[PDB]
mmCIF file of C-alpha atoms in Angstrom:
data_model
loop_
_atom_site.group_PDB
_atom_site.id
_atom_site.type_symbol
_atom_site.label_atom_id
_atom_site.label_comp_id
_atom_site.label_asym_id
_atom_site.label_seq_id
_atom_site.Cartn_x
_atom_site.Cartn_y
_atom_site.Cartn_z
ATOM 1 C CA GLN A 1 -34.086 -15.271 -10.865
ATOM 2 C CA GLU A 2 -32.189 -18.582 -9.701
ATOM 3 C CA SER A 3 -30.755 -16.647 -6.524
ATOM 4 C CA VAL A 4 -34.361 -15.271 -5.441
ATOM 5 C CA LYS A 5 -35.634 -18.977 -6.079
ATOM 6 C CA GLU A 6 -33.375 -20.404 -3.903
ATOM 7 C CA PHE A 7 -33.717 -17.946 -1.139
ATOM 8 C CA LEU A 8 -36.959 -18.546 -1.253
ATOM 9 C CA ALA A 9 -36.350 -22.425 -1.320
ATOM 10 C CA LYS A 10 -34.039 -22.266 1.964
ATOM 11 C CA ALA A 11 -36.668 -19.782 3.615
ATOM 12 C CA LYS A 12 -39.382 -22.265 3.275
ATOM 13 C CA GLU A 13 -37.182 -25.516 4.668
ATOM 14 C CA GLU A 14 -36.712 -23.259 7.794
ATOM 15 C CA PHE A 15 -40.074 -22.109 7.918
ATOM 16 C CA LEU A 16 -41.254 -25.939 7.836
ATOM 17 C CA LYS A 17 -38.462 -27.078 10.394
ATOM 18 C CA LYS A 18 -39.638 -24.834 13.098
ATOM 19 C CA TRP A 19 -43.375 -25.162 11.905
ATOM 20 C CA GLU A 20 -43.411 -28.886 12.795
ATOM 21 C CA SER A 21 -41.958 -28.508 15.869
ATOM 22 C CA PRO A 22 -43.108 -25.052 17.362
ATOM 23 C CA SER A 23 -41.210 -23.882 20.652
ATOM 24 C CA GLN A 24 -43.363 -23.479 23.745
ATOM 25 C CA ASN A 25 -43.163 -22.077 27.329
ATOM 26 C CA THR A 26 -39.772 -20.142 26.676
ATOM 27 C CA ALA A 27 -40.336 -17.328 29.625
ATOM 28 C CA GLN A 28 -42.425 -16.628 32.481
ATOM 29 C CA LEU A 29 -44.636 -13.642 33.637
ATOM 30 C CA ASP A 30 -42.340 -12.847 36.611
ATOM 31 C CA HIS A 31 -39.208 -12.490 34.766
ATOM 32 C CA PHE A 32 -40.785 -9.203 33.634
ATOM 33 C CA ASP A 33 -41.235 -5.793 34.677
ATOM 34 C CA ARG A 34 -44.712 -4.025 33.686
ATOM 35 C CA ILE A 35 -44.084 -0.407 32.174
ATOM 36 C CA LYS A 36 -46.938 1.158 30.297
ATOM 37 C CA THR A 37 -49.966 -0.027 28.147
ATOM 38 C CA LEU A 38 -49.376 0.582 24.815
ATOM 39 C CA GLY A 39 -52.489 -0.785 23.070
ATOM 40 C CA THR A 40 -55.808 -2.450 23.989
ATOM 41 C CA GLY A 41 -58.269 -4.696 22.296
ATOM 42 C CA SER A 42 -61.610 -6.786 22.694
ATOM 43 C CA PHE A 43 -59.631 -9.505 24.294
ATOM 44 C CA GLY A 44 -55.957 -8.679 24.644
ATOM 45 C CA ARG A 45 -53.657 -6.005 25.448
ATOM 46 C CA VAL A 46 -49.846 -4.724 24.245
ATOM 47 C CA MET A 47 -47.495 -3.909 27.235
ATOM 48 C CA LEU A 48 -44.182 -2.405 27.276
ATOM 49 C CA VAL A 49 -42.090 -4.601 29.768
ATOM 50 C CA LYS A 50 -38.374 -4.593 30.747
ATOM 51 C CA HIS A 51 -36.767 -7.874 31.414
ATOM 52 C CA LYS A 52 -35.182 -8.094 34.927
ATOM 53 C CA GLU A 53 -32.167 -9.652 34.158
ATOM 54 C CA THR A 54 -30.853 -8.281 31.009
ATOM 55 C CA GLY A 55 -32.743 -4.714 31.253
ATOM 56 C CA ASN A 56 -34.130 -5.376 27.591
ATOM 57 C CA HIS A 57 -37.325 -3.845 26.692
ATOM 58 C CA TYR A 58 -40.018 -6.138 24.851
ATOM 59 C CA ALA A 59 -43.665 -5.650 23.772
ATOM 60 C CA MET A 60 -45.737 -8.366 25.231
ATOM 61 C CA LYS A 61 -49.008 -9.159 24.094
ATOM 62 C CA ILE A 62 -51.232 -10.515 26.639
ATOM 63 C CA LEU A 63 -54.782 -12.520 25.550
ATOM 64 C CA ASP A 64 -57.580 -13.355 28.362
ATOM 65 C CA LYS A 65 -58.237 -17.064 27.403
ATOM 66 C CA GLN A 66 -61.805 -17.114 28.316
ATOM 67 C CA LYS A 67 -62.346 -14.150 25.981
ATOM 68 C CA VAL A 68 -60.191 -15.516 23.098
ATOM 69 C CA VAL A 69 -62.975 -18.536 23.645
ATOM 70 C CA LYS A 70 -65.825 -16.192 23.689
ATOM 71 C CA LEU A 71 -65.132 -14.108 20.926
ATOM 72 C CA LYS A 72 -64.470 -17.408 18.910
ATOM 73 C CA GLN A 73 -60.657 -17.045 18.405
ATOM 74 C CA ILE A 74 -59.270 -20.125 19.472
ATOM 75 C CA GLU A 75 -58.010 -21.503 15.939
ATOM 76 C CA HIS A 76 -56.631 -17.618 15.080
ATOM 77 C CA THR A 77 -54.664 -17.285 18.286
ATOM 78 C CA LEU A 78 -53.262 -20.561 18.117
ATOM 79 C CA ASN A 79 -52.490 -19.618 14.145
ATOM 80 C CA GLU A 80 -50.853 -16.549 15.498
ATOM 81 C CA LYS A 81 -48.297 -17.864 17.825
ATOM 82 C CA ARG A 82 -47.242 -20.865 15.642
ATOM 83 C CA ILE A 83 -46.395 -18.740 12.734
ATOM 84 C CA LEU A 84 -44.706 -16.158 14.413
ATOM 85 C CA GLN A 85 -42.507 -18.698 16.216
ATOM 86 C CA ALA A 86 -41.534 -20.084 12.713
ATOM 87 C CA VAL A 87 -41.101 -17.011 10.447
ATOM 88 C CA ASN A 88 -37.926 -14.676 9.649
ATOM 89 C CA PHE A 89 -37.790 -11.838 7.567
ATOM 90 C CA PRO A 90 -35.797 -8.160 7.832
ATOM 91 C CA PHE A 91 -39.561 -6.262 8.056
ATOM 92 C CA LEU A 92 -41.430 -8.900 10.164
ATOM 93 C CA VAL A 93 -41.648 -8.218 14.014
ATOM 94 C CA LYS A 94 -39.410 -10.863 15.768
ATOM 95 C CA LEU A 95 -41.348 -13.126 18.558
ATOM 96 C CA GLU A 96 -38.757 -13.416 21.255
ATOM 97 C CA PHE A 97 -40.584 -15.634 23.962
ATOM 98 C CA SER A 98 -43.978 -17.228 24.546
ATOM 99 C CA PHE A 99 -45.808 -18.567 27.468
ATOM 100 C CA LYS A 100 -49.019 -18.999 29.071
ATOM 101 C CA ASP A 101 -50.485 -19.485 32.458
ATOM 102 C CA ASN A 102 -53.968 -20.312 34.285
ATOM 103 C CA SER A 103 -55.559 -16.988 32.697
ATOM 104 C CA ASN A 104 -53.758 -15.684 29.739
ATOM 105 C CA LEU A 105 -51.596 -16.236 26.610
ATOM 106 C CA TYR A 106 -48.152 -14.264 26.225
ATOM 107 C CA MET A 107 -46.239 -13.244 23.184
ATOM 108 C CA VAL A 108 -43.130 -11.185 23.870
ATOM 109 C CA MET A 109 -42.200 -9.390 21.043
ATOM 110 C CA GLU A 110 -39.491 -7.117 19.598
ATOM 111 C CA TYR A 111 -40.234 -3.503 20.785
ATOM 112 C CA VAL A 112 -40.413 -1.065 18.150
ATOM 113 C CA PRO A 113 -40.274 2.600 19.588
ATOM 114 C CA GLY A 114 -41.039 4.697 16.368
ATOM 115 C CA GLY A 115 -44.831 3.677 16.412
ATOM 116 C CA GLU A 116 -47.690 3.013 14.169
ATOM 117 C CA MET A 117 -47.112 4.341 10.524
ATOM 118 C CA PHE A 118 -50.844 5.196 11.021
ATOM 119 C CA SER A 119 -49.871 8.324 13.559
ATOM 120 C CA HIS A 120 -47.192 9.693 11.331
ATOM 121 C CA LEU A 121 -49.529 9.289 8.448
ATOM 122 C CA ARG A 122 -52.282 11.353 10.235
ATOM 123 C CA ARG A 123 -49.761 13.974 11.628
ATOM 124 C CA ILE A 124 -48.259 14.821 7.754
ATOM 125 C CA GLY A 125 -51.686 14.300 5.591
ATOM 126 C CA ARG A 126 -50.007 12.176 3.080
ATOM 127 C CA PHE A 127 -46.827 10.976 1.617
ATOM 128 C CA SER A 128 -44.946 11.691 -1.475
ATOM 129 C CA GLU A 129 -44.998 8.944 -3.725
ATOM 130 C CA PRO A 130 -41.140 8.318 -3.645
ATOM 131 C CA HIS A 131 -42.021 7.879 0.347
ATOM 132 C CA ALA A 132 -44.979 5.636 -0.131
ATOM 133 C CA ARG A 133 -43.159 3.544 -2.677
ATOM 134 C CA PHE A 134 -40.456 2.828 -0.029
ATOM 135 C CA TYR A 135 -42.868 1.397 2.424
ATOM 136 C CA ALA A 136 -44.820 -0.355 -0.482
ATOM 137 C CA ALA A 137 -41.567 -2.174 -1.474
ATOM 138 C CA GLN A 138 -41.198 -3.572 1.706
ATOM 139 C CA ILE A 139 -44.529 -4.784 1.561
ATOM 140 C CA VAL A 140 -44.204 -6.523 -1.631
ATOM 141 C CA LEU A 141 -41.285 -8.543 -0.516
ATOM 142 C CA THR A 142 -42.861 -9.372 2.771
ATOM 143 C CA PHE A 143 -45.919 -11.122 0.950
ATOM 144 C CA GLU A 144 -43.486 -12.440 -1.438
ATOM 145 C CA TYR A 145 -41.927 -14.390 1.696
ATOM 146 C CA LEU A 146 -44.956 -15.191 3.329
ATOM 147 C CA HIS A 147 -46.980 -16.568 0.091
ATOM 148 C CA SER A 148 -43.965 -18.692 -0.775
ATOM 149 C CA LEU A 149 -44.691 -20.459 2.821
ATOM 150 C CA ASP A 150 -48.219 -20.632 1.649
ATOM 151 C CA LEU A 151 -49.063 -18.111 4.376
ATOM 152 C CA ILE A 152 -51.790 -15.527 3.961
ATOM 153 C CA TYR A 153 -51.598 -12.328 6.029
ATOM 154 C CA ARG A 154 -54.902 -11.164 6.048
ATOM 155 C CA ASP A 155 -54.697 -7.911 8.495
ATOM 156 C CA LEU A 156 -52.754 -5.169 6.299
ATOM 157 C CA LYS A 157 -53.681 -1.925 7.631
ATOM 158 C CA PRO A 158 -51.383 1.197 8.767
ATOM 159 C CA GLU A 159 -52.270 0.823 12.525
ATOM 160 C CA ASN A 160 -50.082 -2.826 11.910
ATOM 161 C CA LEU A 161 -46.910 -1.539 10.422
ATOM 162 C CA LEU A 162 -44.598 -0.157 12.723
ATOM 163 C CA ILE A 163 -41.574 2.307 12.143
ATOM 164 C CA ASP A 164 -37.905 1.136 13.329
ATOM 165 C CA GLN A 165 -34.802 3.364 14.709
ATOM 166 C CA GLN A 166 -33.519 3.091 10.589
ATOM 167 C CA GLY A 167 -37.127 4.190 9.269
ATOM 168 C CA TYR A 168 -38.028 0.755 7.793
ATOM 169 C CA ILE A 169 -41.135 -1.359 8.499
ATOM 170 C CA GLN A 170 -41.974 -4.139 11.078
ATOM 171 C CA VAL A 171 -45.010 -5.571 10.575
ATOM 172 C CA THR A 172 -47.023 -6.506 13.640
ATOM 173 C CA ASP A 173 -50.300 -8.493 14.383
ATOM 174 C CA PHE A 174 -50.564 -12.050 13.010
ATOM 175 C CA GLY A 175 -53.902 -12.853 14.625
ATOM 176 C CA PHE A 176 -55.662 -13.481 11.209
ATOM 177 C CA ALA A 177 -52.817 -15.181 9.554
ATOM 178 C CA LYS A 178 -52.979 -18.389 8.349
ATOM 179 C CA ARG A 179 -51.390 -21.422 6.422
ATOM 180 C CA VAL A 180 -53.576 -22.265 3.496
ATOM 181 C CA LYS A 181 -52.559 -24.377 0.479
ATOM 182 C CA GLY A 182 -56.045 -23.705 -1.530
ATOM 183 C CA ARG A 183 -59.106 -21.488 -0.355
ATOM 184 C CA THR A 184 -60.144 -20.162 2.810
ATOM 185 C CA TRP A 185 -63.232 -18.615 4.404
ATOM 186 C CA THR A 186 -63.548 -16.584 7.461
ATOM 187 C CA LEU A 187 -64.660 -13.161 7.489
ATOM 188 C CA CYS A 188 -61.742 -11.130 9.102
ATOM 189 C CA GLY A 189 -60.301 -7.653 8.524
ATOM 190 C CA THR A 190 -60.574 -4.295 9.003
ATOM 191 C CA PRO A 191 -63.554 -3.084 6.609
ATOM 192 C CA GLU A 192 -61.813 -0.665 4.695
ATOM 193 C CA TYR A 193 -59.337 -3.207 3.353
ATOM 194 C CA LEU A 194 -61.134 -6.153 2.750
ATOM 195 C CA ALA A 195 -61.226 -7.825 -0.628
ATOM 196 C CA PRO A 196 -64.511 -8.168 -2.445
ATOM 197 C CA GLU A 197 -64.450 -11.989 -2.359
ATOM 198 C CA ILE A 198 -64.296 -11.643 1.636
ATOM 199 C CA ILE A 199 -67.381 -9.261 1.502
ATOM 200 C CA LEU A 200 -69.194 -11.691 -1.023
ATOM 201 C CA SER A 201 -68.641 -14.772 1.698
ATOM 202 C CA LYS A 202 -66.394 -16.791 -1.276
ATOM 203 C CA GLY A 203 -63.988 -19.009 -0.707
ATOM 204 C CA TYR A 204 -60.576 -16.683 -1.169
ATOM 205 C CA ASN A 205 -56.985 -17.212 -1.219
ATOM 206 C CA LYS A 206 -53.675 -15.086 -0.922
ATOM 207 C CA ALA A 207 -54.959 -12.201 -3.735
ATOM 208 C CA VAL A 208 -56.950 -10.918 -0.909
ATOM 209 C CA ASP A 209 -53.477 -9.470 0.528
ATOM 210 C CA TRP A 210 -52.680 -8.136 -2.878
ATOM 211 C CA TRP A 211 -55.713 -6.081 -2.687
ATOM 212 C CA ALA A 212 -54.996 -4.802 0.865
ATOM 213 C CA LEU A 213 -51.769 -3.585 -0.876
ATOM 214 C CA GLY A 214 -53.777 -1.573 -3.417
ATOM 215 C CA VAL A 215 -55.763 0.003 -0.663
ATOM 216 C CA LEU A 216 -52.381 0.761 1.556
ATOM 217 C CA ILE A 217 -50.766 2.099 -1.450
ATOM 218 C CA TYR A 218 -53.769 4.507 -2.363
ATOM 219 C CA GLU A 219 -54.416 5.614 1.378
ATOM 220 C CA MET A 220 -50.268 6.133 1.862
ATOM 221 C CA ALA A 221 -50.555 8.425 -1.284
ATOM 222 C CA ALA A 222 -53.989 10.310 -0.770
ATOM 223 C CA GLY A 223 -54.461 10.264 2.925
ATOM 224 C CA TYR A 224 -57.422 8.448 2.673
ATOM 225 C CA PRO A 225 -58.936 4.967 1.679
ATOM 226 C CA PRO A 226 -60.302 4.498 -1.628
ATOM 227 C CA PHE A 227 -63.506 2.863 -0.609
ATOM 228 C CA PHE A 228 -64.282 5.353 2.559
ATOM 229 C CA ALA A 229 -67.490 6.057 3.835
ATOM 230 C CA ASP A 230 -69.479 6.521 7.022
ATOM 231 C CA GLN A 231 -70.831 2.942 7.688
ATOM 232 C CA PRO A 232 -69.434 -0.231 6.756
ATOM 233 C CA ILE A 233 -72.343 -1.376 4.747
ATOM 234 C CA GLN A 234 -71.854 1.670 2.680
ATOM 235 C CA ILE A 235 -67.831 0.915 2.725
ATOM 236 C CA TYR A 236 -68.714 -2.959 1.325
ATOM 237 C CA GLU A 237 -70.991 -1.308 -1.419
ATOM 238 C CA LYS A 238 -68.323 1.003 -2.838
ATOM 239 C CA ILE A 239 -65.741 -2.115 -2.716
ATOM 240 C CA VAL A 240 -67.780 -4.111 -4.786
ATOM 241 C CA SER A 241 -68.968 -1.623 -7.263
ATOM 242 C CA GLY A 242 -65.681 -1.453 -9.206
ATOM 243 C CA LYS A 243 -65.438 1.796 -9.196
ATOM 244 C CA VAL A 244 -62.733 4.354 -7.604
ATOM 245 C CA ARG A 245 -61.809 7.856 -7.945
ATOM 246 C CA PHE A 246 -57.910 8.553 -8.137
ATOM 247 C CA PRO A 247 -56.782 12.586 -6.821
ATOM 248 C CA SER A 248 -55.401 14.335 -10.029
ATOM 249 C CA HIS A 249 -52.138 14.469 -8.198
ATOM 250 C CA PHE A 250 -51.488 10.774 -8.640
ATOM 251 C CA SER A 251 -49.028 9.753 -10.867
ATOM 252 C CA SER A 252 -50.119 7.951 -14.383
ATOM 253 C CA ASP A 253 -48.316 4.790 -13.017
ATOM 254 C CA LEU A 254 -49.509 5.322 -9.801
ATOM 255 C CA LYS A 255 -52.814 4.783 -11.301
ATOM 256 C CA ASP A 256 -52.237 1.862 -13.406
ATOM 257 C CA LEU A 257 -50.647 0.238 -10.608
ATOM 258 C CA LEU A 258 -53.505 0.576 -8.600
ATOM 259 C CA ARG A 259 -56.412 -0.217 -10.860
ATOM 260 C CA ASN A 260 -54.462 -3.628 -11.336
ATOM 261 C CA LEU A 261 -54.451 -4.400 -7.623
ATOM 262 C CA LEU A 262 -57.689 -2.879 -6.874
ATOM 263 C CA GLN A 263 -59.438 -5.486 -9.653
ATOM 264 C CA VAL A 264 -62.230 -6.601 -8.321
ATOM 265 C CA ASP A 265 -62.184 -9.693 -10.337
ATOM 266 C CA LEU A 266 -59.576 -11.721 -8.529
ATOM 267 C CA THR A 267 -58.491 -13.877 -11.619
ATOM 268 C CA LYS A 268 -57.375 -10.539 -13.459
ATOM 269 C CA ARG A 269 -55.434 -8.747 -10.058
ATOM 270 C CA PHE A 270 -51.950 -8.285 -10.072
ATOM 271 C CA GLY A 271 -50.570 -10.813 -7.697
ATOM 272 C CA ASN A 272 -52.575 -13.513 -8.719
ATOM 273 C CA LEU A 273 -51.591 -13.866 -12.403
ATOM 274 C CA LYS A 274 -49.342 -16.462 -14.170
ATOM 275 C CA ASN A 275 -46.275 -13.885 -13.114
ATOM 276 C CA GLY A 276 -47.422 -13.657 -9.831
ATOM 277 C CA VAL A 277 -45.551 -11.330 -7.740
ATOM 278 C CA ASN A 278 -43.196 -10.073 -10.534
ATOM 279 C CA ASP A 279 -45.919 -8.451 -12.120
ATOM 280 C CA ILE A 280 -45.704 -5.657 -9.279
ATOM 281 C CA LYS A 281 -41.910 -6.111 -8.710
ATOM 282 C CA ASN A 282 -41.527 -4.909 -12.641
ATOM 283 C CA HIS A 283 -44.510 -2.157 -12.964
ATOM 284 C CA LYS A 284 -43.379 1.068 -13.968
ATOM 285 C CA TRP A 285 -44.291 2.399 -10.442
ATOM 286 C CA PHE A 286 -41.774 0.552 -9.180
ATOM 287 C CA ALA A 287 -38.870 1.321 -11.548
ATOM 288 C CA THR A 288 -36.774 3.207 -9.533
ATOM 289 C CA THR A 289 -36.976 0.618 -6.573
ATOM 290 C CA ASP A 290 -33.933 -1.536 -6.075
ATOM 291 C CA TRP A 291 -35.137 -4.670 -4.901
ATOM 292 C CA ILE A 292 -32.195 -6.242 -3.378
ATOM 293 C CA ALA A 293 -30.962 -3.279 -1.820
ATOM 294 C CA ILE A 294 -34.201 -2.618 -0.031
ATOM 295 C CA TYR A 295 -34.015 -6.050 1.477
ATOM 296 C CA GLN A 296 -30.492 -5.461 2.551
ATOM 297 C CA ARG A 297 -31.688 -2.406 4.305
ATOM 298 C CA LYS A 298 -29.004 -0.149 2.357
ATOM 299 C CA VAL A 299 -31.918 2.497 1.285
ATOM 300 C CA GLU A 300 -31.945 5.672 3.384
ATOM 301 C CA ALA A 301 -35.382 5.743 4.808
ATOM 302 C CA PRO A 302 -37.516 9.127 3.920
ATOM 303 C CA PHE A 303 -38.251 9.367 7.625
ATOM 304 C CA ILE A 304 -36.582 8.537 11.027
ATOM 305 C CA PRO A 305 -38.940 8.646 13.989
ATOM 306 C CA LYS A 306 -37.907 11.047 16.823
ATOM 307 C CA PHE A 307 -37.500 9.140 20.111
ATOM 308 C CA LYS A 308 -35.037 9.117 23.193
ATOM 309 C CA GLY A 309 -34.326 5.461 23.677
ATOM 310 C CA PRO A 310 -35.552 1.847 23.474
ATOM 311 C CA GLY A 311 -37.614 2.573 26.475
ATOM 312 C CA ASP A 312 -39.225 5.663 25.505
ATOM 313 C CA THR A 313 -42.990 5.430 24.536
ATOM 314 C CA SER A 314 -44.020 9.115 23.424
ATOM 315 C CA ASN A 315 -44.986 7.410 19.674
ATOM 316 C CA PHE A 316 -47.637 5.375 20.961
ATOM 317 C CA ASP A 317 -50.754 6.473 22.960
ATOM 318 C CA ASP A 318 -52.343 6.468 26.443
ATOM 319 C CA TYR A 319 -54.792 4.021 27.829
ATOM 320 C CA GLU A 320 -56.326 3.431 31.027
ATOM 321 C CA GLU A 321 -54.016 1.007 33.057
ATOM 322 C CA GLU A 322 -55.690 -1.951 34.110
ATOM 323 C CA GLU A 323 -55.018 -4.944 36.204
ATOM 324 C CA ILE A 324 -53.654 -8.152 34.524
ATOM 325 C CA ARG A 325 -55.115 -11.095 37.034
ATOM 326 C CA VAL A 326 -53.878 -14.490 36.873
ATOM 327 C CA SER A 327 -56.365 -17.044 38.513
ATOM 328 C CA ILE A 328 -55.713 -19.552 41.092
ATOM 329 C CA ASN A 329 -57.479 -22.277 38.734
ATOM 330 C CA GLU A 330 -56.599 -23.213 35.347
ATOM 331 C CA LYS A 331 -58.922 -21.975 32.699
ATOM 332 C CA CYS A 332 -59.552 -23.109 29.191
ATOM 333 C CA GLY A 333 -56.819 -25.553 29.453
ATOM 334 C CA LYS A 334 -57.773 -27.977 26.984
ATOM 335 C CA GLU A 335 -58.438 -25.330 24.043
ATOM 336 C CA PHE A 336 -54.681 -24.175 24.508
ATOM 337 C CA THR A 337 -52.812 -27.647 24.927
ATOM 338 C CA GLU A 338 -50.736 -26.639 21.823
ATOM 339 C CA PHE A 339 -49.833 -22.968 22.670
#
């Protein structure tokens, strides 16, 4: 379809202009008030903040440089910020500012008060197929965009999909995203969502994203992931076995799509064939989907999150509120010169 081809051609031109000349140092810490911790990790946290002069709310991701080094995440964190400042798509959380100081790296992103899809899925149990399909279509379009820029996302899971005020998806966390024209080799991702070729330490490509879409659709529609087990070693054994059990309430169209996304042979997997993403968009399971209407956000969402305003944190959970310090001396300056 020429209009989609010309859209993606323009999208790539605009990405490459920002990719080759990244923005840096577009804000500073004392322009923001700290409100609440929204999430915590091994080397970073995400905070709700308020801009002092405008009053706007943002989500500020803060990474400790010394911990990033020790956890061997230097290239990944440079990847995350260079990609985020260059992309632009309706279902990607927008990066608004970035900066660094003696101790930390900061990415100030749009705040999505509806919270994670994971919380809503776990509250309700499972999504109906139309509800799962509405979200799945947004991920298909987002991966079509990212893959046309030669980007692999590599972190699809329900926790990284936030629900906005219109009930649409906003994808967050580009920590494992990478520009890859051929193969790449890093072991990363959450265990339930890893493709077999990652587990087997092969050189892999963008088809691992389409495998992960299969896992996400299964989990949305069933309430649990297809290769679930108590320990990661058992999860990995199931992933590479080539078998998967479908609930009887799954439609025949859903089972057929999932068999082709959860295809252990990457050269036979939907999204990685000669027709590319069109094998997915043309599948019978998506016959009711108006792809342009999804992109333009003209479809009524199945669910509108409940929240009181742009500063409401009730859809996120509670964490110990810990100090964020900035050392008198510069740490790891050379490693993060380009940030």
